[PDB]
């Protein structure tokens, strides 16, 4: 057993094995029985995450492979074409829009969850880390590990969300249209 996760309600458990199987098993009051068993990847399932809106969930593996499975029909929905290396850590935002993948090429990416397009990409090659992305749970900042040897920096702004950033970019443009 490599990784585990709780669902957002707290009644199912997702278990990721070494052979690539993914088991989903109930926890009702005290019973612990197996509901389904699908074969997801050809390799150890590294990390499992959940959408904060409860729509889908994301799995990563030791091939360059990262799916987005929706939670109603339990079928794959979007596939990220990430043929570089093995995904090590994996996390989402709290609005549920940014997806941070960090592979074993020592490079971090940033995608969308609705589409599968790329937003940004930083390369951190001179370090000897296993670098850890982590997003804050209440505001849209993140703490990326590894600055020199094994460290932790965190990346801030003056606005908390993306929604209070668009709302400030709108009101600064509006002054110029109220200027002309």
């Amino acid at each position: 057993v490599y990784s585990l996760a709780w669902s957002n309600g707290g009644s199912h458990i997702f278990i990721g094995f070494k052979s690539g199987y993914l088991a989903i098993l109930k926890a009702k009051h005290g019973i612990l029985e197996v509901c389904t068993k699908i074969k997801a990847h050809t390799g150890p399932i590294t990390e499992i995450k959940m959408d904060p809106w409860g729509r889908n969930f994301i799995t990563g593996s030791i091939d360059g492979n990262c799916y987005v499975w929706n939670m109603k029909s339990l079928c794959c929905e979007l596939i990220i074409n990430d043929l570089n290396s093995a995904v090590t850590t994996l996390d989402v935002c709290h609005l549920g829009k940014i997806l941070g993948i960090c592979t074993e090429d020592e490079m971090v990416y940033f995608y969308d969850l609705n589409s599968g397009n790329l937003l940004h990409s930083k390369s951190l090659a001179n370090y000897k880390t296993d670098p850890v992305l982590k997003f804050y749970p209440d505001k849209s900042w993140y703490i990326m590990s590894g600055k020199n040897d094994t460290l932790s920096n965190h990346f801030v702004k003056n606005e908390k969300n993306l929604i209070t950033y668009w709302k400030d970019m709108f009101d600064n443009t509006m002054i110029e249209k109220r200027r002309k």
Partner: protein, 511 residues
């Protein structure tokens, strides 16, 4: 002067002949869409329209044009007032009402004066104003086709381009595909944005299946014009399939309604728990979405009232000869629909295990999976998960009838369908580019690139790989290293290719 003041009808056909009489007609229609009370006083707005265009002698053709032109700006919220207004006026076909839901009555129509204004107005897309109002006007004309206000073939025949001009542009495009399988640029961007092709997919978004089945059965290469025609027809087939798929995976999918919920937001005043706040908007895009705080829905919620979701397995086998034969090898553009039909098959073999009706149940799923599931698997680009779901249905088969399907799809590749032949020639061109730059230092990351190409379609990509093993040395140690990332489908095809090269007709012994 004889046929001007004795025979000419005294009516006013333009918006300048009565600026006073047409100015009160528009302002009465602006007012009618701002009432809370709009269904109790429908007949109080008609009797004020007939008193306006009797007092000022307004035309009866230009007036119905102004009503359809103002009511297309307000079609997102009020489309039940606009339908209930037209059903009480004296321009509704009372005895010619004939429907587009039948197959013999797409010529028996009603109100050919309104069919003369609609098809004239869908044909104008050259100015910068009516390129932005085209999606609202075209969406209004598809609610009038559902109800039986206009005939279907009266719009299809008389809207631009022409069916002789459409048929020569397809054949110019089919030639461009056969060259890769081994004035116009501004016109083609006006074919797939406006006209017949845009009309054919707004009808399939809203509800209309019978006029679209009848067109694509006549001209089956109306596909290869847009890749949207196979997406929106997979939105209709996935609505009919979905009550069945939830019941076949019975206990699991019924509680999956409760597993989809989100996490509350927890602030640290008293450490309390509050839910998340969103707000709805009704848009014109068919697919449901959710942005940072806004969720979007389709505005026309009665789009699925003529359809009926079918029963268990005997109705799926009848309704798939109609829908799934139109998009033949194009079901692989909707990979989530190819994964849903394959789980109906595994769940039906296992529940009908028994001991009596099992050799009959397998045979019914042999002919289904080889007519229109295995051709769809070959038009796939990078989907190792969509191909594993198909193979878990083919694990229940004897291996003789699994080797029949593999060889035939290398024989009716070329002699038969074109979109399968362009796909096989893209995998062979990509497998022959990896194998040339295959060194012992580059297999850290070219092992993962090569193993998704094999896992998606092996029959195109494995055959140039074992043909470059018996030619040069030092490539057995590289291909066996890549085999740790295969799936169970590419392990069963590799045994078939090796049995193909050993019995292949060649001089075994040297001279």
């Amino acid at each position: 002067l004889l046929k001007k003041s004795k025979y000419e009808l005294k009516k006013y056909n333009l918006l300048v002949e009565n600026s006073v009489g047409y100015g009160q007609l528009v302002a009465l229609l602006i007012l009618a869409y701002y009432d809370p009370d709009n269904f109790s006083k429908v007949s109080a707005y008609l009797k004020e329209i007939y008193h306006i265009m009797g007092k000022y002698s307004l035309d009866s053709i230009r007036t119905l044009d102004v009503i359809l032109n103002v009511s297309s700006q307000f079609i997102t919220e009020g489309y039940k007032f606009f339908i209930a207004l037209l059903r009480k006026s004296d321009s509704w076909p009372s005895s010619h009402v004939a429907n587009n839901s039948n197959y013999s009555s797409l010529n028996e129509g009603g109100n050919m004066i309104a069919a003369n204004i609609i098809s004239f107005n869908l044909s104008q897309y050259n100015e910068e104003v009516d390129k932005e109002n085209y999606e609202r006007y075209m969406d209004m004309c598809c609610i009038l086709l559902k109800n039986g206000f206009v005939n279907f073939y009266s719009i299809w025949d008389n809207v631009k381009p022409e069916m002789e001009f459409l048929q020569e542009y397809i054949q110019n495009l089919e030639t461009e595909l056969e060259e890769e399988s081994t004035g116009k640029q501004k016109t083609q961007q006006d074919i797939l944005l406006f006209g017949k092709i845009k009309l054919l997919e707004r009808l399939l978004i809203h509800g209309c299946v019978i006029p679209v089945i009848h067109v694509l059965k006549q001209y089956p290469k109306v596909l290869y014009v847009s890749e949207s025609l196979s997406r929106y027809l997979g939105r209709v087939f996935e609505y009919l399939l979905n009550p069945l798929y939830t019941s076949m995976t019975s206990s699991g999918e019924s509680k999956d309604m409760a597993t989809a919920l989100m996490i509350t937001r927890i602030d640290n005043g008293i450490l309390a728990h509050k839910p998340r706040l969103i707000h709805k908007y009704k848009t014109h895009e068919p697919f449901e979405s959710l942005e940072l705080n806004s969720s979007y829905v389709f505005y026309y919620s009665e789009w699925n009232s003529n359809l009926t979701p079918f029963a268990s397995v005997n109705d799926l086998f009848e309704n798939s000869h109609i829908y799934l034969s139109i998009i033949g090898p194009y079901l692989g553009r909707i990979p989530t629909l190819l994964s849903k039909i394959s789980r109906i098959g595994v769940a039906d073999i296992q529940k009908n295990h028994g001991s009596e009706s099992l050799h009959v149940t397998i045979d019914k799923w042999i002919d289904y999976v080889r007519k229109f599931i295995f051709p769809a698997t070959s038009l796939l680009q990078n989907n190792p998960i969509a191909t594993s779901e198909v193979y878990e249905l083919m694990k229940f088969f004897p291996f003789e009838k699994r080797y029949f399907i593999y060889n035939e799809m290398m024989t009716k590749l070329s002699q038969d369908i074109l979109p399968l032949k362009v796909s096989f020639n893209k995998a062979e061109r990509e497998a022959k580019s990896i194998l040339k730059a295959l060194s012992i230092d580059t297999i850290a990351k070219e092992s993962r690139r090569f193993a998704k190409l094999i896992s998606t379609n092996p029959l195109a990509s494995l055959v140039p790989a074992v043909k470059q093993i018996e030619n040069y040395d030092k490539v057995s140690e590289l291909v066996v290293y890549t085999t740790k990332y295969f799936n169970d489908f590419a392990y069963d095809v590799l045994q078939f290719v090796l049995l193909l090269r050993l019995t292949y007709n060649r001089p075994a012994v040297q001279f």
